[PDB]
């Protein structure tokens, strides 16, 4: 019950599913054959949330994979933990979008959307108690941000009361992979905030940097990154599939974290995490967790968490410990960071504890809070989008694909205004 | 004088491919906690080796029945020791020092003149080429990813195979130059983790093990792969290891519990078999039939190919035995506590009788009760459970007895009440009732966990064992009279000497301190090794002798009349934890801390 | 069969019965389709739905025309004084048969048979030692 | 099974949106086929049971014999898409007197005769998705003048696509019915 | 719609490796096809050692010449099984070429 | 058939062609061991052609 569907799209959303799914199976010890060989009774009590029952006693995840070009699809199955996916669910095209936002949202996707979209009802109707839809996609991939974003609008059009999860990775300005990174984001953002109830930002620059400063791993690999991507993701519902002192489903975290309908952006954090060298030296302490999960470098985005004021905080504690130890630890930091803590709403920090920690760890906590600091990011991307706009650069493709600059113009107008309005409350005082 | 051993009960399959039937058989090597023991099949005689510090990490035997080699894992600062051992001489030949913690495994070339070792996940997985005749550092080079094992080619020692974590690289070694060659196999649309190696005898093709459970095909001629594996079926935890039959048929045992064979043709299992536990070792005897199989749960099984009917030889305690007990005035059957489960074992012959197991809990101080009632234990959760001897079902549950779990339990002569040990400085008594179970313990105050509890014949008074020492004798009737024999150490097991107010006790310090009911000391034994602490003691029915086992590998039994020893124990590894005497007193049995069970014939001139 | 069961070291009786079981080409051929190719050596045998066709290996086709069957065709080209001169074993070894299967070690094979059955019976137990040798 | 339970407004015995739409239900099949497919007429998932010799294919409400699904709900109602072909349904009823009866409706029968054990009754099916409200209150009194107590069994035969089975318990309009019960027009 | 939909189905059938693929034509597919884009040109298994799997369970005793069932013609001796042809099925559902 | 698929047929339905060959058989000389049931159907015939 309280189940949500897994939807991974675009090139940046695929491997995470190739990795996120692996993690879950390890979380429930689900063997590569889809047959349960776990150790604890609690392991399976709520497996319907992410795993369904099939004939013969095997399990198949309830995820729908898609893309405009089959090559990326032709890779997930060859990877470890691919035998769980159902062969029928795959839907693929023949040409691709080529990092062209207009192609994935105006011409190509419109015809192919139904086939991939169609399977939504067959699944969404399949749920015993739908909780929401979680989307893992990147605004930096033209095929993704074009095809991926539209599905949200159609998806939302049928279940308005539902609450939706989106995990989008915006290419940080520090490192760029496709010269058209600015374009596809700006128009995507305009639609993105149009439907999404929740959202999470992630920058690769912040992603690998934590590896170089904290993890210090010798040779980073995307696979190492994916393990980083889900780890924080894995905590999203960890409290949703097992009991706890104060059960925390997906919705209530939504209720406690979005002060206004329009200002619904957060940053996250995952702990514990350290380099291989000191794997034994430190001592796992809640005070150790609280400082780190309040450590700025622990943030998943390049934006400095100390560069703004925290709208609110949410604590998802993994593992056991005394309840009182939860409350005192949180309050002290707010007092020691009052200048960093807004005064509109006292106790803007949410504390919940999960009784089933990650495998191989005793105490774990993922940080989630709405930080105004996001006002920098929307400035940089737009400035990158704005500055190159004046030269009419690369503009003829979307204009030649049925879309007009007015659609280009409208995006920033709803982009820059949201930038100020988010920062408008920053200078407000009681 | 040492103490005679009449049998050894114990086995560990943690180190892969531990079992191997010696070429021509009659010899087999199975790693104990830290020592190597070789046993004869036709005859029951066996030889012992004890020249090692830490536990074994890998064991393998060179072809043609020459000397053996292996490796182990020590602490990070120190370096693992190499395990070159001869054959037909039973004498240590060479010793080497290198590597940080542990090396994955060893395997010799076709000739007995080359040796190579691959370091653990530490040391960047250092691989070095060693000389069989004498110790030298020929040459070596590192590797970026972790290689979990290496096996040399049946022929043409110049070329070997190593199945690295992310890629299977064929390494080439040339004598002319010290360098080592590396070529990368290409697997487009492949991301599989691999575990085992199997080079075909022809040396052209070979096969390996995978975590998914599918066996790939790769010939040494070129890195390209050829096949997929058993279509439409997987073993649910990959491949533990692989072996090659004379016909080429591949016999595989899924660690999930399965024995399967894939023939060299479109691979459809002709026959299947699943054995309890997780397969760990696959070895072929002479004339190629009835291979030897040992699981990960320390199980040894015998099979017949072409119809896989598992047949059990014998298995052993999972690891780190907890305690021993004997039936009142009875020694035919003895039981013990394991890390998660309990078992019932026969004395005359070591064939298992029956068992009582708990899912994810560890127990302490398993004891038997008079009148067959019953097998009672308090578990990590603190609950107290009792089971019937005939079948593994519980009689009554006493839950939430201790916050940090039970620690002690014994038997009252009338057993109308129970006596236990509390870790949080508590001792709780229970006047059991058949209709319901209730407690009336005073809930006393104590600094440390109670490590033992004793009941005298008249069962009024009682002596309490402690970690902070605090040897507080409880009146057990009024729940008062807190007077404790003094010592500023961490005591251990304590028992009552027969028909005597003298209490033979041991503490943290290396000394068998004597204390009476009037703070009198007969003598300070001074039984202590360099860093060995005696952890178990007892007294015979007649106050003539007492057998003691310290933290040392030795079994140290002394006479109570005077501090003069008679015989001792040898051949033990780990930290022995308890020593009891059977009611017949014909033998004294103690188990190894690592999961080793040994029985010793007590000296005749003590009855 | 006669000198065939001795050829592959199999019982005389089984071979004959084994011959009949493979013989029923009709039963597997009476049904529709199921074309076959039975070669087992020099010549190949093929079958479509019902038609028949076959070819003969040239190399074997060549030697029958090797101008050397003249001594084969007549019955009395040999000296005829050797019939009791030669033991059937002498020509037996040189025949194309008895060499199809390699000669394994006769007394060595007797060896492993004395052992594998040795461990099975005496491995029922592995505890009793009566030989301590703790130090070595 | 539905005993000592609160039954006031509705009891969705068979419903077409769930992980295991028929868990309590038991099925026996001889020559037809059982499968669920999205309906063209209405964008929803509905169960379908297709076969021939309708007397052979069917699905039973209670899992197995020796238990009764007794229900104090007075009304019965049930939804189907007409396939312009054979269809049948029958239910079991317990009377005030300690006797067990059953009332059958037939798509392919023209004559009905009140008779002590069974009273077969013809049916007429309307084109397109149709909802039929079974009284189950007047019929019991009309058959033998013996009131209703509880429904003992519910059976559905083959060659009919069913979207939901529930007990209305009272004449309710479409407006009264909740969104789940109400069948929104395509 | 119509075309371009199965193209998403060929790979799906091609999806399973199983040491095989479905190129949409494997055997008995019409007479033949053009050898290249234009018309063709004028001038263009592993088996085991069967003698190895040996004596898994059956003992190695042999009966030998010493035999004879004459005189022991009791009613309990087994009777040789006669032959029975297999059920014919024809090829109603087989491929047609 | 391929002269190799067929033998997968004869050894399949034992009642169709029941006999001594549906099981592995002992060997005359004590040295050799009985082969796998299907195998004896391969050793016997291969020689016959020779
Ligand atoms: N963690 C991780 N990120 C990746 C990987 N491959 C690509 N990305 C991210 O995806 C972004 C590019 O997305 P793109 O392929 O253009 O999306 P698409 O055009 O919709 O398919 C880059 O900024 C990368 O940071 C990977 O293997 N691991």
Swiss-Prot record, chain A:
Keyword annotations: Cytoplasm, Cytoskeleton, GTP-binding, Magnesium, Metal-binding, Microtubule, Nucleotide-binding
Keyword Glycoprotein: no
InterPro entries for this protein: Beta-tubulin_BS, Beta_tubulin, Tub_FtsZ_C, Tubulin, Tubulin/FtsZ-like_C, Tubulin/FtsZ_2-layer-sand-dom, Tubulin/FtsZ_GTPase_sf, Tubulin_C
Localization (cell): Cytoplasm, Cytoskeleton
GO CC, one annotated term: cytoplasm
List of residues binding GTP: 11, 69, 138, 142-144, 204, 226
Signal peptide (UniProt feature, chain positions): none
PTM comment: Some glutamate residues at the C-terminus are either polyglutamylated or polyglycylated. These 2 modifications occur exclusively on glutamate residues and result in either polyglutamate or polyglycine chains on the gamma-carboxyl group. Both modifications can coexist on the same protein on adjacent residues, and lowering polyglycylation levels increases polyglutamylation, and reciprocally. The precise function of such modifications is still unclear but they regulate the assembly and dynamics of axonemal microtubules.
Ligand binding (Mg(2+)): 69
PROSITE patterns given in the database record: TUBULIN, TUBULIN_B_AUTOREG
One MF annotation (Gene Ontology) recorded for this entry: GTPase activity
Pfam families, alphabetized: Tubulin, Tubulin_C
Family membership: Belongs to the tubulin family.
Functional note: Tubulin is the major constituent of microtubules, a cylinder consisting of laterally associated linear protofilaments composed of alpha- and beta-tubulin heterodimers. Microtubules grow by the addition of GTP-tubulin dimers to the microtubule end, where a stabilizing cap forms. Below the cap, tubulin dimers are in GDP-bound state, owing to GTPase activity of alpha-tubulin.
Protein name: Tubulin beta chain
């Amino acid at each position: 019950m309280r189940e949500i569907v897994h939807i991974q799209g675009g090139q940046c959303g695929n491997q995470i599913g190739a990795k996120f799914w692996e993690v879950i199976s390890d979380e429930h010890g689900i063997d590569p054959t889809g047959t349960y060989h776990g150790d604890s009774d609690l392991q399976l009590e709520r497996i319907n949330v992410y795993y369904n029952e099939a004939t013969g006693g095997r399990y198949v995840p309830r995820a729908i994979l898609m893309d405009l070009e089959p090559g990326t699809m032709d890779s997930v199955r060859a990877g470890p933990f691919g035998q769980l996916f159902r062969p029928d669910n795959f839907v693929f095209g023949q040409t691709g979008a080529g990092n062209n936002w207009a192609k994935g949202h105006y011409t190509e996707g419109a015809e192919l959307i139904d086939s991939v979209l169609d399977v939504v009802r067959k699944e969404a109707e399949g749920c015993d108690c739908l909780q929401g839809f979680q989307i893992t996609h990147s605004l930096g991939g033209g095929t993704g941000s074009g095809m991926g974003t539209l599905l949200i609008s159609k998806v939302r059009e049928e279940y308005p009361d539902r609450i939706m999860e989106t995990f989008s990775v915006v290419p940080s300005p520090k490192v760029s992979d496709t010269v058209v990174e600015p374009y596809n984001a700006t128009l995507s953002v305009h639609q993105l905030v149009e439907n999404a109830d929740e959202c999470m930002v992630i920058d690769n620059e912040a992603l690998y940097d934590i590896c170089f400063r904290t993890l210090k791993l010798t040779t980073p690999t995307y696979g190492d990154l994916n393990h980083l991507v889900s780890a924080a993701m894995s905590g999203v519902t960890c409290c949703l599939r097992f009991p706890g002192q104060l059960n925390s489903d997906l919705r209530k975290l939504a209720v406690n974290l979005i002060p206004f309908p329009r200002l619904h952006f957060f940053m996250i954090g995952f702990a514990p995490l350290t380099s291989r060298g000191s794997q034994q030296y430190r001592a796992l302490t809640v005070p150790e967790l609280t400082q780190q999960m309040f450590d700025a470098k622990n943030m998943m985005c390049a934006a400095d968490p100390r560069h703004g004021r925290y709208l609110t905080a949410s604590a998802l504690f993994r593992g056991r410990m005394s309840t009182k130890e939860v409350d005192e630890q949180m309050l002290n930091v707010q007092n020691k960071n009052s200048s960093y803590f807004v005064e509109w709403i006292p106790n803007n920090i949410k504390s919940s504890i999960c009784d089933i920690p990650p495998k191989g760890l005793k105490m774990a906590v993922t940080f989630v809070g709405n930080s105004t600091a996001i006002q920098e990011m929307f400035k940089r991307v737009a400035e990158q989008f704005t500055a190159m706009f004046r030269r009419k650069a690369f503009l003829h493709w979307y204009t030649g694909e049925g879309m007009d600059e007015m659609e280009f113009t409208e995006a920033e107008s709803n982009m820059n205004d949201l930038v100020s309005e988010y920062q408008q409350y920053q200078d407000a005082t009681a | 004088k040492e103490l005679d051993i009449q049998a050894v009960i114990g086995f560990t399959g943690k180190v892969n491919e531990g079992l191997i039937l010696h070429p021509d058989n009659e010899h087999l090597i199975y790693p104990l906690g830290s020592t190597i023991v070789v046993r004869h099949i036709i005859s029951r005689s066996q030889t012992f080796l004890r020249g090692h510090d830490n536990q074994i990490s890998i064991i393998t035997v060179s072809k043609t029945g020459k000397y053996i080699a292996s490796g182990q894992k020590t602490y990070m600062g120190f370096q693992a020791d190499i395990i070159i051992w001869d054959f037909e001489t039973r004498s240590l030949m060479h010793r080497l020092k290198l590597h940080k913690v542990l090396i994955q495994s060893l395997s010799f070339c076709c000739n007995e003149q080359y040796l190579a070792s691959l370091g653990g996940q530490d040391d960047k997985n250092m691989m070095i080429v060693w000389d069989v005749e004498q110790g030298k550092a020929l040459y070596g080079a590192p590797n970026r990813d972790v290689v979990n094992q290496i096996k040399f080619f049946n022929n043409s020692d110049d070329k070997i195979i190593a199945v690295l974590n992310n890629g299977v690289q064929i390494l080439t070694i040339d004598k002319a130059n010290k360098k080592v060659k590396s070529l990368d196999v290409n697997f487009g649309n492949i991301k599989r983790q691999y575990t085992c190696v199997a080079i075909d005898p022809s040396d052209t093709y070979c096969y390996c093990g995978t975590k998914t459970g599918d066996v790939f095909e790769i010939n040494i001629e070129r890195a390209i792969f050829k096949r997929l594996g058993p279509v439409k079926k997987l073993f649910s935890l990959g491949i533990g290891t692989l072996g090659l039959l004379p016909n080429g048929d591949i016999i595989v045992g899924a660690g999930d519990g399965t024995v399967a064979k894939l023939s060299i043709q479109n691979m459809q299992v002709l026959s299947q078999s699943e054995v309890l536990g997780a397969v760990t070792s696959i070895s072929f005897t002479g004339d190629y039939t009835h291979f030897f199989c040992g699981t990960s749960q320390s199980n040894i099984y015998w099979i017949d190919t072409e119809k896989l009917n598992p047949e059990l030889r014998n298995t052993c305690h999972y690891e780190r035995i907890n305690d021993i007990a004997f039936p009142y005035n009875y020694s035919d059957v003895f039981a013990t506590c394991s890390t998660t489960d309990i078992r019932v074992w026969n004395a005359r012959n070591r064939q298992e009788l029956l068992r009582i197991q708990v899912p994810n809990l560890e127990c302490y101080c398993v004891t038997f009760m008079n009148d067959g009632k019953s097998i009672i234990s308090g578990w990590n959760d603190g609950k107290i459970r009792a089971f019937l001897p005939q079948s593994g079902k519980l009689l009554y549950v006493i839950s939430d007895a201790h916050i940090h779990g039970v620690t002690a339990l014994s038997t009252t002569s009338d057993c109308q009440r129970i006596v236990s040990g509390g870790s949080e400085g508590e001792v709780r008594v229970w006047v059991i009732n058949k209709q319901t179970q209730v407690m009336k313990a005073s809930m006393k105050e104590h600094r440390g966990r109670v490590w033992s509890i004793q009941v005298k014949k008249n069962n009024d008074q009682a002596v309490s064992a402690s970690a902070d020492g605090s040897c507080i004798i409880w009146d057990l009737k009024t729940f008062t009279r807190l007077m404790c024999l003094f010592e500023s150490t961490l005591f251990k097991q304590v028992l009552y000497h027969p028909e005597e107010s003298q209490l033979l006790t041991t503490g943290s310090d290396r000394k068998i301190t004597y204390w009476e009911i009037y703070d009198g000391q007969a003598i300070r034994m001074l039984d202590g090794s360099e860093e060995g602490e005696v952890n178990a003691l007892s007294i015979t029915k007649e106050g003539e002798h007492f057998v003691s086992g310290g933290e040392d590998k030795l079994v140290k039994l002394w006479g109570y009349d005077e501090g003069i020893k008679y015989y001792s124990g040898t051949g033990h590894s780990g930290a022995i934890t308890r020593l009891q005497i059977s009611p017949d007193q014909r033998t004294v049995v103690s188990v190894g801390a690592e999961g080793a069970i040994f029985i010793w014939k007590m000296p005749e001139e003590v009855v | 069969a006669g000198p065939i069961a001795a050829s592959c070291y199999l019982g005389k009786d089984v071979v004959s019965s084994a011959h009949n079981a493979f013989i029923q080409a009709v039963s597997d051929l009476t049904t529709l389709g199921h074309g076959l190719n039975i070669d087992f050596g020099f010549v190949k045998v093929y079958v479509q739905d019902r038609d028949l066709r076959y070819s003969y290996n040239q190399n074997f086709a060549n030697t029958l025309n090797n101008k050397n069957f003249e001594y084969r065709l007549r019955k009395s080209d040999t000296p005829t004084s050797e019939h009791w001169n030669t033991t059937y074993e002498s020509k037996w070894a040189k025949s194309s048969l008895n060499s199809l299967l390699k000669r394994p070690n006769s007394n060595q094979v007797r060896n492993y048979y004395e052992k594998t059955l040795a461990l099975k019976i005496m491995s029922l137990d592995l505890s009793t030692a009566e030989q301590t040798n703790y130090s070595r | 099974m539905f005993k000592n339970t609160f039954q006031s407004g509705f009891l969705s015995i068979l419903y077409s949106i769930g992980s295991k739409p028929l868990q309590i239900w038991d099925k026996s099949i001889r020559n037809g086929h059982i499968k669920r497919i999205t309906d063209q007429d209405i964008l929803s998932s509905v169960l379908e049971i297709m076969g021939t010799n309708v007397s052979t294919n069917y699905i039973t409400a209670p899992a197995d014999p020796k238990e009764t699904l007794g229900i104090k709900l007075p009304f019965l109602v049930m939804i189907i898409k007409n396939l312009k072909k054979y269809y049948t349904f029958e239910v079991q009823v317990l009377d005030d007197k300690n006797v067990r009866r059953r009332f059958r409706a037939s798509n392919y029968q023209s004559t009905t005769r009140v008779k002590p054990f069974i009273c077969t009754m013809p049916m007429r099916l309307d084109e397109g998705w149709n909802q039929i409200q079974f009284n189950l209150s007047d019929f019991t009194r009309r058959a033998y003048a013996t009131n209703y107590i509880e429904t003992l069994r519910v059976q559905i035969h083959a060659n009919c696509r069913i979207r939901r089975i529930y007990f209305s318990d009272r004449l309710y309009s479409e407006e009264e019915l909740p969104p789940e019960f109400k069948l929104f027009l395509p | 719609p119509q075309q371009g939909n199965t193209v998403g189905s060929i790979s799906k059938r091609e999806n399973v490796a199983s040491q095989l693929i479905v190129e949409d034509h494997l055997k008995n597919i019409l007479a033949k096809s053009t050898n290249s884009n234009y018309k063709p040109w004028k001038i263009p298994q592993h088996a085991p050692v069967f003698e190895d799997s040996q004596a898994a369970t059956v003992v190695n005793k042999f009966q030998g010449l010493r035999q004879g069932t004459g005189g022991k013609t009791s009613t309990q001796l087994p009777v040789k099984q006669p032959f029975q042809a297999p059920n014919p099925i024809c090829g109603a559902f087989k491929k047609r070429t | 058939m391929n002269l190799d698929s067929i033998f997968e047929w004869i050894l399949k339905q034992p009642i169709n062609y029941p006999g001594k060959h549906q099981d592995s058989q002992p060997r005359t000389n004590p040295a050799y061991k009985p082969l796998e049931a299907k195998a004896q159907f391969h050793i016997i015939f291969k020689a016959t052609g020779e």
